[PDB]
Amino acid sequence: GYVLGSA
Amino acid sequence: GYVLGSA
Amino acid sequence: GYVLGSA
Amino acid sequence: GYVLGSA
Amino acid sequence: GYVLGSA
Amino acid sequence: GYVLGSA
Amino acid sequence: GYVLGSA
Amino acid sequence: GYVLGSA
């Protein structure tokens, strides 16, 4: 799995 | 932008 | 912005 | 799992 | 910015 | 920018 | 696991 | 696994 956000 | 997670 | 959690 | 927030 | 933790 | 973690 | 924050 | 953030 993964978790990704823009910043 | 975006935010993405596996589930 | 955003806020994300697994559940 | 995960927890993610913008800041 | 951001804040991220495993769970 | 970005923030990414495995899960 | 991990914990990460911008500063 | 991994954890990566821009700075």
mmCIF file of N, CA, C and O in Angstrom:
data_model
loop_
_atom_site.group_PDB
_atom_site.id
_atom_site.type_symbol
_atom_site.label_atom_id
_atom_site.label_comp_id
_atom_site.label_asym_id
_atom_site.label_seq_id
_atom_site.Cartn_x
_atom_site.Cartn_y
_atom_site.Cartn_z
ATOM 1 N N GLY A 1 0.817 -1.202 0.000
ATOM 2 C CA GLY A 1 0.000 0.000 0.000
ATOM 3 C C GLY A 1 0.853 1.254 0.000
ATOM 4 O O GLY A 1 2.080 1.182 -0.074
ATOM 5 N N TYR A 2 0.203 2.406 0.089
ATOM 6 C CA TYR A 2 0.905 3.679 -0.032
ATOM 7 C C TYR A 2 0.012 4.805 0.442
ATOM 8 O O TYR A 2 -1.211 4.657 0.554
ATOM 9 N N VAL A 3 0.636 5.950 0.678
ATOM 10 C CA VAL A 3 -0.089 7.171 0.980
ATOM 11 C C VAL A 3 0.746 8.306 0.384
ATOM 12 O O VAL A 3 1.968 8.350 0.555
ATOM 13 N N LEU A 4 0.082 9.191 -0.356
ATOM 14 C CA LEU A 4 0.763 10.224 -1.133
ATOM 15 C C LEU A 4 -0.030 11.515 -1.081
ATOM 16 O O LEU A 4 -1.244 11.508 -1.291
ATOM 17 N N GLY A 5 0.642 12.631 -0.816
ATOM 18 C CA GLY A 5 -0.019 13.921 -0.886
ATOM 19 C C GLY A 5 0.868 14.959 -1.551
ATOM 20 O O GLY A 5 2.094 14.886 -1.485
ATOM 21 N N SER A 6 0.239 15.923 -2.212
ATOM 22 C CA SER A 6 0.966 17.058 -2.753
ATOM 23 C C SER A 6 1.327 18.012 -1.610
ATOM 24 O O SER A 6 0.663 18.031 -0.577
ATOM 25 N N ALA A 7 2.374 18.808 -1.802
ATOM 26 C CA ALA A 7 2.770 19.776 -0.791
ATOM 27 C C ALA A 7 3.596 20.905 -1.402
ATOM 28 O O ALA A 7 3.734 20.995 -2.616
ATOM 29 N N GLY B 1 -3.299 19.969 -6.847
ATOM 30 C CA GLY B 1 -2.754 19.016 -5.894
ATOM 31 C C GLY B 1 -3.651 17.804 -5.739
ATOM 32 O O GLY B 1 -4.646 17.659 -6.457
ATOM 33 N N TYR B 2 -3.305 16.936 -4.796
ATOM 34 C CA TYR B 2 -4.003 15.665 -4.654
ATOM 35 C C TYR B 2 -3.634 15.013 -3.337
ATOM 36 O O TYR B 2 -2.621 15.356 -2.707
ATOM 37 N N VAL B 3 -4.443 14.038 -2.951
ATOM 38 C CA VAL B 3 -4.143 13.196 -1.808
ATOM 39 C C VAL B 3 -4.710 11.814 -2.149
ATOM 40 O O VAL B 3 -5.843 11.694 -2.627
ATOM 41 N N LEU B 4 -3.892 10.785 -1.949
ATOM 42 C CA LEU B 4 -4.209 9.430 -2.385
ATOM 43 C C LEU B 4 -3.734 8.422 -1.362
ATOM 44 O O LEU B 4 -2.588 8.493 -0.906
ATOM 45 N N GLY B 5 -4.589 7.471 -1.005
ATOM 46 C CA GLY B 5 -4.164 6.396 -0.129
ATOM 47 C C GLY B 5 -4.722 5.062 -0.583
ATOM 48 O O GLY B 5 -5.792 4.991 -1.186
ATOM 49 N N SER B 6 -3.980 3.998 -0.298
ATOM 50 C CA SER B 6 -4.478 2.653 -0.530
ATOM 51 C C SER B 6 -5.484 2.296 0.559
ATOM 52 O O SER B 6 -5.443 2.845 1.657
ATOM 53 N N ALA B 7 -6.388 1.372 0.250
ATOM 54 C CA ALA B 7 -7.395 0.948 1.211
ATOM 55 C C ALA B 7 -7.843 -0.484 0.932
ATOM 56 O O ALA B 7 -7.405 -1.096 -0.037
ATOM 57 N N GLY C 1 -5.614 22.060 1.080
ATOM 58 C CA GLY C 1 -5.069 21.107 2.033
ATOM 59 C C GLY C 1 -5.966 19.895 2.189
ATOM 60 O O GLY C 1 -6.961 19.750 1.470
ATOM 61 N N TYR C 2 -5.620 19.026 3.131
ATOM 62 C CA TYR C 2 -6.319 17.756 3.273
ATOM 63 C C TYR C 2 -5.949 17.104 4.590
ATOM 64 O O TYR C 2 -4.937 17.446 5.221
ATOM 65 N N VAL C 3 -6.758 16.128 4.976
ATOM 66 C CA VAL C 3 -6.458 15.286 6.120
ATOM 67 C C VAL C 3 -7.026 13.904 5.778
ATOM 68 O O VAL C 3 -8.158 13.785 5.300
ATOM 69 N N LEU C 4 -6.207 12.875 5.979
ATOM 70 C CA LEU C 4 -6.524 11.520 5.542
ATOM 71 C C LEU C 4 -6.049 10.513 6.565
ATOM 72 O O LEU C 4 -4.903 10.583 7.021
ATOM 73 N N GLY C 5 -6.904 9.561 6.922
ATOM 74 C CA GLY C 5 -6.480 8.486 7.798
ATOM 75 C C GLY C 5 -7.037 7.152 7.345
ATOM 76 O O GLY C 5 -8.108 7.081 6.741
ATOM 77 N N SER C 6 -6.295 6.088 7.629
ATOM 78 C CA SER C 6 -6.793 4.743 7.398
ATOM 79 C C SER C 6 -7.800 4.386 8.486
ATOM 80 O O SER C 6 -7.758 4.936 9.584
ATOM 81 N N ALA C 7 -8.703 3.462 8.177
ATOM 82 C CA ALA C 7 -9.710 3.039 9.138
ATOM 83 C C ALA C 7 -10.158 1.606 8.859
ATOM 84 O O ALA C 7 -9.721 0.994 7.890
ATOM 85 N N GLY D 1 -1.498 0.889 7.927
ATOM 86 C CA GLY D 1 -2.315 2.090 7.927
ATOM 87 C C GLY D 1 -1.463 3.344 7.927
ATOM 88 O O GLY D 1 -0.235 3.272 7.854
ATOM 89 N N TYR D 2 -2.113 4.496 8.016
ATOM 90 C CA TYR D 2 -1.411 5.770 7.895
ATOM 91 C C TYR D 2 -2.303 6.895 8.369
ATOM 92 O O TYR D 2 -3.527 6.747 8.481
ATOM 93 N N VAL D 3 -1.679 8.040 8.605
ATOM 94 C CA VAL D 3 -2.404 9.261 8.908
ATOM 95 C C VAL D 3 -1.570 10.396 8.312
ATOM 96 O O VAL D 3 -0.347 10.440 8.482
ATOM 97 N N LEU D 4 -2.233 11.281 7.572
ATOM 98 C CA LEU D 4 -1.552 12.314 6.794
ATOM 99 C C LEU D 4 -2.345 13.606 6.846
ATOM 100 O O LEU D 4 -3.559 13.598 6.637
ATOM 101 N N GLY D 5 -1.673 14.721 7.112
ATOM 102 C CA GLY D 5 -2.335 16.012 7.041
ATOM 103 C C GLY D 5 -1.447 17.049 6.376
ATOM 104 O O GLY D 5 -0.222 16.976 6.442
ATOM 105 N N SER D 6 -2.076 18.014 5.715
ATOM 106 C CA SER D 6 -1.349 19.149 5.174
ATOM 107 C C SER D 6 -0.989 20.102 6.317
ATOM 108 O O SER D 6 -1.653 20.122 7.351
ATOM 109 N N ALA D 7 0.059 20.898 6.125
ATOM 110 C CA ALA D 7 0.455 21.867 7.137
ATOM 111 C C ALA D 7 1.281 22.996 6.525
ATOM 112 O O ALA D 7 1.419 23.085 5.312
ATOM 113 N N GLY E 1 3.557 22.429 3.679
ATOM 114 C CA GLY E 1 4.102 21.476 4.633
ATOM 115 C C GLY E 1 3.205 20.264 4.788
ATOM 116 O O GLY E 1 2.211 20.119 4.069
ATOM 117 N N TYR E 2 3.552 19.395 5.731
ATOM 118 C CA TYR E 2 2.853 18.125 5.872
ATOM 119 C C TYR E 2 3.222 17.473 7.189
ATOM 120 O O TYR E 2 4.235 17.815 7.820
ATOM 121 N N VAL E 3 2.413 16.497 7.576
ATOM 122 C CA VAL E 3 2.713 15.655 8.719
ATOM 123 C C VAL E 3 2.146 14.273 8.377
ATOM 124 O O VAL E 3 1.014 14.154 7.900
ATOM 125 N N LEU E 4 2.964 13.244 8.578
ATOM 126 C CA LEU E 4 2.647 11.889 8.141
ATOM 127 C C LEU E 4 3.123 10.882 9.165
ATOM 128 O O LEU E 4 4.268 10.952 9.620
ATOM 129 N N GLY E 5 2.268 9.930 9.522
ATOM 130 C CA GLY E 5 2.692 8.855 10.397
ATOM 131 C C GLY E 5 2.135 7.521 9.944
ATOM 132 O O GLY E 5 1.064 7.450 9.340
ATOM 133 N N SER E 6 2.876 6.457 10.228
ATOM 134 C CA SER E 6 2.379 5.112 9.997
ATOM 135 C C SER E 6 1.372 4.755 11.086
ATOM 136 O O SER E 6 1.413 5.305 12.183
ATOM 137 N N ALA E 7 0.469 3.831 10.776
ATOM 138 C CA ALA E 7 -0.539 3.408 11.737
ATOM 139 C C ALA E 7 -0.987 1.975 11.459
ATOM 140 O O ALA E 7 -0.549 1.363 10.489
ATOM 141 N N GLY F 1 5.873 20.338 -4.248
ATOM 142 C CA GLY F 1 6.418 19.385 -3.295
ATOM 143 C C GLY F 1 5.521 18.173 -3.139
ATOM 144 O O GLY F 1 4.526 18.028 -3.858
ATOM 145 N N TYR F 2 5.867 17.305 -2.197
ATOM 146 C CA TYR F 2 5.168 16.034 -2.055
ATOM 147 C C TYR F 2 5.538 15.382 -0.738
ATOM 148 O O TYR F 2 6.550 15.725 -0.107
ATOM 149 N N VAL F 3 4.729 14.407 -0.352
ATOM 150 C CA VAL F 3 5.029 13.565 0.792
ATOM 151 C C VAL F 3 4.461 12.183 0.450
ATOM 152 O O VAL F 3 3.329 12.063 -0.028
ATOM 153 N N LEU F 4 5.279 11.154 0.651
ATOM 154 C CA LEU F 4 4.963 9.798 0.214
ATOM 155 C C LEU F 4 5.438 8.791 1.237
ATOM 156 O O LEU F 4 6.584 8.862 1.693
ATOM 157 N N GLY F 5 4.583 7.840 1.594
ATOM 158 C CA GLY F 5 5.007 6.765 2.470
ATOM 159 C C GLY F 5 4.450 5.431 2.017
ATOM 160 O O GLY F 5 3.379 5.360 1.413
ATOM 161 N N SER F 6 5.192 4.367 2.301
ATOM 162 C CA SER F 6 4.694 3.022 2.070
ATOM 163 C C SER F 6 3.687 2.665 3.158
ATOM 164 O O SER F 6 3.729 3.214 4.256
ATOM 165 N N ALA F 7 2.784 1.741 2.849
ATOM 166 C CA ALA F 7 1.777 1.317 3.810
ATOM 167 C C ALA F 7 1.329 -0.115 3.531
ATOM 168 O O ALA F 7 1.766 -0.727 2.562
ATOM 169 N N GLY G 1 7.674 1.258 10.527
ATOM 170 C CA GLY G 1 6.856 2.459 10.527
ATOM 171 C C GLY G 1 7.709 3.713 10.527
ATOM 172 O O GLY G 1 8.936 3.641 10.453
ATOM 173 N N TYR G 2 7.059 4.865 10.616
ATOM 174 C CA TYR G 2 7.761 6.139 10.494
ATOM 175 C C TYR G 2 6.868 7.264 10.969
ATOM 176 O O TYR G 2 5.645 7.116 11.080
ATOM 177 N N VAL G 3 7.492 8.409 11.205
ATOM 178 C CA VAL G 3 6.767 9.630 11.507
ATOM 179 C C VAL G 3 7.602 10.765 10.911
ATOM 180 O O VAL G 3 8.825 10.809 11.081
ATOM 181 N N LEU G 4 6.938 11.650 10.171
ATOM 182 C CA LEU G 4 7.619 12.683 9.394
ATOM 183 C C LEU G 4 6.827 13.975 9.446
ATOM 184 O O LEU G 4 5.612 13.967 9.236
ATOM 185 N N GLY G 5 7.499 15.090 9.711
ATOM 186 C CA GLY G 5 6.837 16.381 9.641
ATOM 187 C C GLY G 5 7.725 17.418 8.975
ATOM 188 O O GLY G 5 8.950 17.345 9.042
ATOM 189 N N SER G 6 7.096 18.383 8.315
ATOM 190 C CA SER G 6 7.823 19.517 7.773
ATOM 191 C C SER G 6 8.183 20.471 8.917
ATOM 192 O O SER G 6 7.519 20.491 9.950
ATOM 193 N N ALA G 7 9.231 21.267 8.725
ATOM 194 C CA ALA G 7 9.627 22.236 9.736
ATOM 195 C C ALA G 7 10.453 23.365 9.125
ATOM 196 O O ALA G 7 10.590 23.454 7.911
ATOM 197 N N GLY H 1 9.989 -0.833 2.599
ATOM 198 C CA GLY H 1 9.172 0.369 2.599
ATOM 199 C C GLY H 1 10.024 1.623 2.599
ATOM 200 O O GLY H 1 11.252 1.551 2.526
ATOM 201 N N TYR H 2 9.374 2.775 2.688
ATOM 202 C CA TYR H 2 10.076 4.048 2.567
ATOM 203 C C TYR H 2 9.184 5.174 3.041
ATOM 204 O O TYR H 2 7.960 5.026 3.153
ATOM 205 N N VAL H 3 9.808 6.319 3.277
ATOM 206 C CA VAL H 3 9.082 7.540 3.580
ATOM 207 C C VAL H 3 9.917 8.675 2.984
ATOM 208 O O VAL H 3 11.140 8.718 3.154
ATOM 209 N N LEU H 4 9.254 9.560 2.244
ATOM 210 C CA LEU H 4 9.935 10.593 1.466
ATOM 211 C C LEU H 4 9.142 11.884 1.518
ATOM 212 O O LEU H 4 7.928 11.877 1.309
ATOM 213 N N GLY H 5 9.814 13.000 1.784
ATOM 214 C CA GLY H 5 9.152 14.290 1.713
ATOM 215 C C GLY H 5 10.040 15.328 1.048
ATOM 216 O O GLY H 5 11.265 15.255 1.114
ATOM 217 N N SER H 6 9.411 16.292 0.387
ATOM 218 C CA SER H 6 10.138 17.427 -0.154
ATOM 219 C C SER H 6 10.498 18.381 0.989
ATOM 220 O O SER H 6 9.834 18.400 2.023
ATOM 221 N N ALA H 7 11.546 19.177 0.797
ATOM 222 C CA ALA H 7 11.942 20.145 1.809
ATOM 223 C C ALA H 7 12.768 21.274 1.197
ATOM 224 O O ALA H 7 12.905 21.364 -0.016
#
